[PDB]
Tab-separated table of C-alpha atoms in Angstrom:
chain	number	residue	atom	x	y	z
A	1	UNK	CA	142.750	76.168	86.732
A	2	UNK	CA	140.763	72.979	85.861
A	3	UNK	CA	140.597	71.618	89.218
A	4	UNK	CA	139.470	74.857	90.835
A	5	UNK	CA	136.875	74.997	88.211
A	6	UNK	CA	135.766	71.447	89.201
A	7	UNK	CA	135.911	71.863	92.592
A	8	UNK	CA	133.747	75.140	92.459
A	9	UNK	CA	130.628	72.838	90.235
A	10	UNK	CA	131.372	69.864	92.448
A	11	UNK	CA	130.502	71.697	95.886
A	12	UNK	CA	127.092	72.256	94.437
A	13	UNK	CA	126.487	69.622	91.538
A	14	UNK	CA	122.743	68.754	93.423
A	15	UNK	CA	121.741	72.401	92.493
A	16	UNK	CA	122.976	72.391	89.332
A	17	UNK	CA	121.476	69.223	88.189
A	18	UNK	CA	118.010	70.052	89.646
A	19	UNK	CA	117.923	73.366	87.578
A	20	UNK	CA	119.390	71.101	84.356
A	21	UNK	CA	116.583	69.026	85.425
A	22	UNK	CA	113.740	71.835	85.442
A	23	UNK	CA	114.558	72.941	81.940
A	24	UNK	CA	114.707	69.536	80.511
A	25	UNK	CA	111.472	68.534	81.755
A	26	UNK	CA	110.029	72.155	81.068
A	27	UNK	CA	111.562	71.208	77.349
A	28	UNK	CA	109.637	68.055	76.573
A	29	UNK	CA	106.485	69.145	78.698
A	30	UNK	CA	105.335	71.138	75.246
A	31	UNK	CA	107.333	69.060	72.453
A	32	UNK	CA	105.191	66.801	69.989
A	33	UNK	CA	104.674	62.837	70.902
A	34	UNK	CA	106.102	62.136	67.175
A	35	UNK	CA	110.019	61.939	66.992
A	36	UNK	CA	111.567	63.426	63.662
A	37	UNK	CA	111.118	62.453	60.551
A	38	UNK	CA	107.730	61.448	61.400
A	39	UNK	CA	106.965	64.808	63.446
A	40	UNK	CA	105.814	66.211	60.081
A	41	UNK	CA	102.605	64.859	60.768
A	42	UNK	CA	101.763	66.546	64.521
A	43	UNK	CA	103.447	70.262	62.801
A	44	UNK	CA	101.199	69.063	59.956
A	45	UNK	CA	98.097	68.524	62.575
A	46	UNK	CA	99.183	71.710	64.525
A	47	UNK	CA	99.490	73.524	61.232
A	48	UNK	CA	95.828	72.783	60.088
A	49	UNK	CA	94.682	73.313	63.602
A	50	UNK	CA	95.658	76.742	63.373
A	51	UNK	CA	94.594	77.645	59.577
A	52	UNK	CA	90.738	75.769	60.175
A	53	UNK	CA	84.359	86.050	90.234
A	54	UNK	CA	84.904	81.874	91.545
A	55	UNK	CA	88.859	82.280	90.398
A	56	UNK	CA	89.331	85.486	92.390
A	57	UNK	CA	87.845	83.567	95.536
A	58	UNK	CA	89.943	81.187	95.358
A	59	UNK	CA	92.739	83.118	94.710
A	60	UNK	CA	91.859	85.127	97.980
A	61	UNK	CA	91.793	81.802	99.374
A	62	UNK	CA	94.864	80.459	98.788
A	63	UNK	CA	96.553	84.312	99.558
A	64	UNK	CA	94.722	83.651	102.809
A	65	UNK	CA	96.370	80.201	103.074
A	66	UNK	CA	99.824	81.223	102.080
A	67	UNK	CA	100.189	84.746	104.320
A	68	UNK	CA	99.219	82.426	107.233
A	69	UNK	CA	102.067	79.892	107.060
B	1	UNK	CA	74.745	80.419	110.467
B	2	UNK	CA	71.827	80.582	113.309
B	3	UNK	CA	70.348	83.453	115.405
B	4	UNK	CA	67.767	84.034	118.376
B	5	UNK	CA	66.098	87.049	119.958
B	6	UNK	CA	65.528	85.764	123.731
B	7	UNK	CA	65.532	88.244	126.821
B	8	UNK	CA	68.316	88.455	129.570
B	9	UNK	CA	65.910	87.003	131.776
B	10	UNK	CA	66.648	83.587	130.787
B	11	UNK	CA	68.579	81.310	132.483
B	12	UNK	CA	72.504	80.039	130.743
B	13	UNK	CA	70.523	76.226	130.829
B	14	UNK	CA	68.178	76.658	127.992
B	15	UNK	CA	70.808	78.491	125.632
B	16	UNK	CA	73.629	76.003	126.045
B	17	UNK	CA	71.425	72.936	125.560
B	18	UNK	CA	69.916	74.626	122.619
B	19	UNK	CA	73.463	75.627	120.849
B	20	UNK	CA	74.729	71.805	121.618
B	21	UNK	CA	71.845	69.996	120.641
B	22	UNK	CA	69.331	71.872	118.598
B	23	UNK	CA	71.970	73.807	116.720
B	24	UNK	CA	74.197	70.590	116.346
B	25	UNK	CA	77.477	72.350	117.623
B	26	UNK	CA	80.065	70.414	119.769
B	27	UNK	CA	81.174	71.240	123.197
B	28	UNK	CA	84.132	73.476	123.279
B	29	UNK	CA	87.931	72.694	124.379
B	30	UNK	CA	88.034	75.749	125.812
B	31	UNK	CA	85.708	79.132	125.975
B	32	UNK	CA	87.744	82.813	125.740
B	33	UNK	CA	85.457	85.922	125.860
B	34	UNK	CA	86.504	88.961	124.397
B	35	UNK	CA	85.887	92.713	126.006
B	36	UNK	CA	86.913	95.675	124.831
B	37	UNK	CA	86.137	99.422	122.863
B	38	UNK	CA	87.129	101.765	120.847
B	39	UNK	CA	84.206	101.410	119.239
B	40	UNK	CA	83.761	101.980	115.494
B	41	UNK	CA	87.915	102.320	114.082
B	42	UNK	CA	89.657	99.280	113.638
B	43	UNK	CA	92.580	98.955	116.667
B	44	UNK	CA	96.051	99.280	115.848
B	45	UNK	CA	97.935	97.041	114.095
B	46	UNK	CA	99.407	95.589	116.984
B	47	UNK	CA	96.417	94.390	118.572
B	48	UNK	CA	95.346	92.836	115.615
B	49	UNK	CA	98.905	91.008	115.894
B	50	UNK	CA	97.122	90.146	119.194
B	51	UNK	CA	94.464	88.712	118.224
B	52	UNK	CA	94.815	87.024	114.727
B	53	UNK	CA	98.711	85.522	115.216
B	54	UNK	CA	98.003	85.496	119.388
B	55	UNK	CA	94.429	84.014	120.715
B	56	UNK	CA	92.925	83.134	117.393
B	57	UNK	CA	96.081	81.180	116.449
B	58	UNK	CA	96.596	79.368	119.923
B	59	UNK	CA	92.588	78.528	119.468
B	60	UNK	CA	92.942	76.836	116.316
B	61	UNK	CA	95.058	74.116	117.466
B	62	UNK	CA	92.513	72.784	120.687
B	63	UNK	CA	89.376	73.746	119.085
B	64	UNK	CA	87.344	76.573	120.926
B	65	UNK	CA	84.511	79.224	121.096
B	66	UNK	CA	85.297	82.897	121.122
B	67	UNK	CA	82.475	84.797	122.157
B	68	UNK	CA	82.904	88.728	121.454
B	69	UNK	CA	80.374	91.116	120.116
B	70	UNK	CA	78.287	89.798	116.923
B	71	UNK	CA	78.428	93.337	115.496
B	72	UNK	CA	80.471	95.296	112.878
B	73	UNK	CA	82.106	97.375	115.874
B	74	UNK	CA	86.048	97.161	115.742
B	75	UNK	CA	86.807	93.932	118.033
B	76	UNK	CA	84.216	91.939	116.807
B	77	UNK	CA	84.794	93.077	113.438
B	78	UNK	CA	88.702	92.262	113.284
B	79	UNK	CA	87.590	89.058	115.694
B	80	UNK	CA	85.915	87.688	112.847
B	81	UNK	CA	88.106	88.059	110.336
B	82	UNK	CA	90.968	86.259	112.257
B	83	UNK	CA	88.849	83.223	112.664
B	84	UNK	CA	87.963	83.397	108.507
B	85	UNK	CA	91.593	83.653	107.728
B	86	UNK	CA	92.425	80.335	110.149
B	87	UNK	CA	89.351	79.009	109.260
């Protein structure tokens, strides 16, 4: 059972990774620059941050450009 | 864009020179005229096929000048909005 389980993930490992890849970077696109313990301070800065016509033409535009390739 | 009221008395000379050299636009690859009616509805969608993926397409790669009627009728009308959507 183990080695048709690896054998079904190994035909297609690429794929796999490249979605495991997506999500990482999606993950640390939005985290805080400071590392724990000393993320306190950017939830600290986020925390007092929070308590203290052209776009539709070139949306056409690019429509225009994608429906033609 | 430019425009000109001129009679059909004049000779093809004047007008060319004027539209390469006065007007500032380059000599065409290649030249394909457009004739045709049904007058004010748009053609069917076929024809449109025609014209946008067909002659407008095909154009866009050498470089050319399609000459059709300058008006809102339905050839000249679908005519120019193939060339926008390449263009």
């Amino acid at each position: 059972m183990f080695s048709y389980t690896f054998g079904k993930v190994q035909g297609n490992s690429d794929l796999y990774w490249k979605a495991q890849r997506y999500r990482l970077i999606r993950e640390f696109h939005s985290r805080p620059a400071l590392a724990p313990p000393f993320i306190v301070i950017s939830h600290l800065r986020l925390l007092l941050r929070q308590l203290c016509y052209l776009s539709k033409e070139a949306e056409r535009k690019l429509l225009t450009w994608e429906s033609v390739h | 864009s430019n425009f000109l009221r001129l009679s059909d008395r004049t000779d093809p000379a004047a007008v060319y020179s004027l539209v390469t050299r006065t007007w500032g636009f380059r000599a065409p690859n290649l030249v394909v005229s457009v004739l045709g009616g049904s007058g004010g509805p748009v053609l069917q969608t076929w024809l449109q096929d025609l014209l946008r993926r067909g002659l407008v397409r095909a154009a866009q790669s050498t470089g050319a000048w399609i000459v059709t009627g300058g008006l809102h009728t339905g050839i000249g009308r679908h005519v120019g909005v193939a060339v926008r959507d390449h263009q």
